[PDB]
Every structure is written in structure tokens, then in C-alpha cells.
Amino acid sequence: NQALLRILKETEFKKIKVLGSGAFGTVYKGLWIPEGEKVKIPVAIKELREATSPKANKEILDEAYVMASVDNPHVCRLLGICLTSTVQLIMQLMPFGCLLDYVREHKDNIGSQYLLNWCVQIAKGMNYLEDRRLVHRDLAARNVLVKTPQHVKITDFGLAKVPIKWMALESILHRIYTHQSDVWSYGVTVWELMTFGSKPYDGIPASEISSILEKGERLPQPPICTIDVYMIMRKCWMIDADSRPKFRELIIEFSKMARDPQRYLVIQGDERMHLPSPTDSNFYRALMDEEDM
Numbered sequence: 222n223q224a225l226l227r228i229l230k231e232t233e234f235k236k237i238k239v240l241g242s243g244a245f246g247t248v249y250k251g252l253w254i255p256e257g258e259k260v261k262i263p264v265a266i267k268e269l270r271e272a273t274s275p276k277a278n279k280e281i282l283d284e285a286y287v288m289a290s291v292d293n294p295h296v297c298r299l300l301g302i303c304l305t306s307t308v309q310l311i312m313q314l315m316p317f318g319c320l321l322d323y324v325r326e327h328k329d330n331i332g333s334q335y336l337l338n339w340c341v342q343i344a345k346g347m348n349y350l351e352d353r354r355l356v357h358r359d360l361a362a363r364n365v366l367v368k369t370p371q372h373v374k375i376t377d378f379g380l381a382k383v384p385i386k387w388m389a390l391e392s393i394l395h396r397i398y399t400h401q402s403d404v405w406s407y408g409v410t411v412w413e414l415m416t417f418g419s420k421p422y423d424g425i426p427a428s429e430i431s432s433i434l435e436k437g438e439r440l441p442q443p444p445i446c447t448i449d450v451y452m453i454m455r456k457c458w459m460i461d462a463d464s465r466p467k468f469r470e471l472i473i474e475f476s477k478m479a480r481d482p483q484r485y486l487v488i489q490g491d492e493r494m495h496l497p498s499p500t501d502s503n504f505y506r507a508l509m510d511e512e513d514m
């Protein structure tokens with residue numbers, strides 16, 4: 222639907238603060254200023270790194286139309302685009318930030334109910350992408366945004382068209398990207414969460430990752446994970462892509478674990494850590510998260 226993607230004028234928005242910058246461009250916290258109005262609406266703005274040609278822009282715009290067409294409570298959707306010399310893209314601002322920073326910031330103060338529910342929601346969002354037959358190619362804890370502590374959303378999918386330590390072996394060797402290679406990255410993403418944001422294969426050169434994987438080496442069991450959870454992660458990292466679980470199977474398996482969370486994650490002081498109440502859930506949703514879930 223063409224109406225799902227707004228073409229913006231440069232006067233409609235202003236960048237206020239950098240959220241971070243890489244080789245992929247700069248992402249700013251911004252304000253949307255509707256023409257004729259006095260309101261300033263917080264948004265996220267992405268400025269690409271290189272200036273692009275009109276023909277390059279058309280291809281960017283074609284993909285932007287697809288990314289604006291996703292409609293799922295656990296997937297972020299692209300909202301708008303501004304076609305200057307460098308292209309700027311607009312999406313909803315998530316004030317809580319990304320899930321990677323969140324688990325590092327709340328290290329050891331996150332209960333098992335949150336961690337397992339995040340795994341369900343990420344798998345639900347990935348299952349939606351598969352049903353829309355869109356391959357993410359860069360699923361990681363940095364690309365899961367926190368709408369509320371109870372509600373996370375996948376972002377940055379489809380943009381790669383390299384995160385070696387998140388990629389399936391077939392992607393490293395043959396640059397093959399499928400939904401099953403997304404399942405591999407999902408397993409690494411869950412490992413990031415269960416380790417509260419540790420770096421996978423920390424200290425190991427990226428050039429050597431393909432070698433250790435062929436020998437059967439995998440990421441180690443997180444201390445808080447029971448073998449039931451680690452076994453699921455290990456199945457995600459099988460060489461045979463068709464033997465890896467499917468996302469809808471991951472939804473079901475983590476859902477049952479989420480209804481008995483202390484049986485599947487061993488966390489010191491779990492019986493203290495705040496579980497979300499209906500009171501806190503109604504307040505969060507009425508305030509900043511009114512979408513259907």
C-alpha cells in the first residue's frame with residue numbers, strides 16, 4: 222500500500238540528538254513538526270551514510286514501501302522517508318532503547334518471566350516475517366527494541382539488501398540467507414538475552430568463526446539456563462538448516478516455558494524480582510502502548 226509510507230519534506234522534522242552512529246548511517250532522536258500545527262512529535266530518524274543517486278533512491282523507495290507494510294505487534298514498521306542528497310528514514314521512537322542495552326543495564330535484575338516472554342515475542346515477530354516471506358538477515362539483541370519492559374519489537378529487517386558471530390554457517394560460507402538462517406541468529410539473540418548482553422565468541426577473531434563452527438563448537442550454556450533452554454538454542458545452530466526448529470515451534474516451546482518460568486531459568490533472587498502486575502500493564506498500555514496485542 223502506497224499510503225502506508227509517508228514522503229516527508231525536510232521542513233517537517235528536526236534532528237535533536239544522536240542515538241548512535243555506525244557504517245550504516247546515523248540514527249537521531251527527532252521531532253516531527255506537522256505543517257500548520259504547533260506540535261512537536263518525537264520520532265527516530267535515520268540518515269544514511271553515503272549520498273545516493275535517483276536510481277538508487279527508487280530502489281530504496283521500493284523496499285521502503287514493503288517495510289511500511291508490516292503490521293504486527295512485535296515488528297517495527299517503517300513510517301516515512303525524506304529524499305535529500307542523503308536519504309532520511311523515520312520510524313517510531315522507542316524511549317526504552319534496544320533490548321541489548323536494556324539487559325546489560327538491568328543485569329541480574331531481570332526475572333525469568335520477562336526473559337522468556339521476550340523470547341516468545343521475538344519468535345512471534347520472526348514468524349510474522351516468515352509468513353510475509355521477508356528474511357531479516359540481521360536479527361540480534363541490538364535489533365530488538367523495547368517499547369515497554371513488557372513489549373519488545375523487531376527492527377532493521379531487510380536492510381542488508383557483516384555480523385559474522387550472529388550468522389549461520391551457510392551464510393558465512395555461501396552468503397545464503399533464508400528463514401532458517403534467521404533461526405540460527407534467533408538462537409544467538411536468545412543467548413545474548415540469557416547472558417544479559419555478553420558478546421558471543423568474545424575475543425575470537427571473526428575470520429576464525431567459520432572454522433570453530435565446522436568443528437562442532439557452539440556458544441556455551443548460560444549459567445541461568447536449564448538444559449531444556451540450552452537444548453533449544455543448540456538445535457537452532459545445527460549445520461543442517463532443515464533440522465533447525467521453525468519459529469512457530471519456537472513460539473510454542475517458549476510459551477510453555479513462560480507459564481512455568483522458574484522451572485526453566487535459574488536466577489538468583491528470582492522470587493524477589495518484579496513480575497508485571499495488571500495494574501502496571503494497564504498503565505503502560507494506556508500511556509504509550511495502545512496498539513492491539
Ligand SMILES: *CCC(=O)Nc1cc(Nc2nccc(-c3cn(C)c4ccccc34)n2)c(OC)cc1N(C)CCN(C)C
Nearest residue numbers: 240241242248265313314315316317318319320321322363
Ligand atoms: C541497541 C542500541 C539502541 O538502540 N539504543 C537506543 C535506542 C532508542 N530508541 C530507538 N527507537 C527507534 C529506532 C532506534 C534505532 C534504530 N537503529 C538502527 C539504531 C542505531 C543506534 C541507536 C538507535 C537505533 N532506536 C533510544 O531512545 C531514547 C535511546 C538509545 N540509547 C543509545 C540509550 C543509551 N542506553 C540505552 C545505553
Ligand SMILES: O=C1c2ccccc2Nc2ccc(F)cc2N1Cc1ccccc1
Nearest residue numbers: 265266267297298299310311312377378380
Ligand atoms: O533503516 C531501516 C530500513 C531502511 C530501508 C529498508 C528497510 C529498513 N529496515 C527497517 C524495518 C523496519 C523498521 F521499523 C525500521 C527499519 N530501518 C531502521 C530505521 C528506519 C528509520 C529510522 C530509524 C531506523
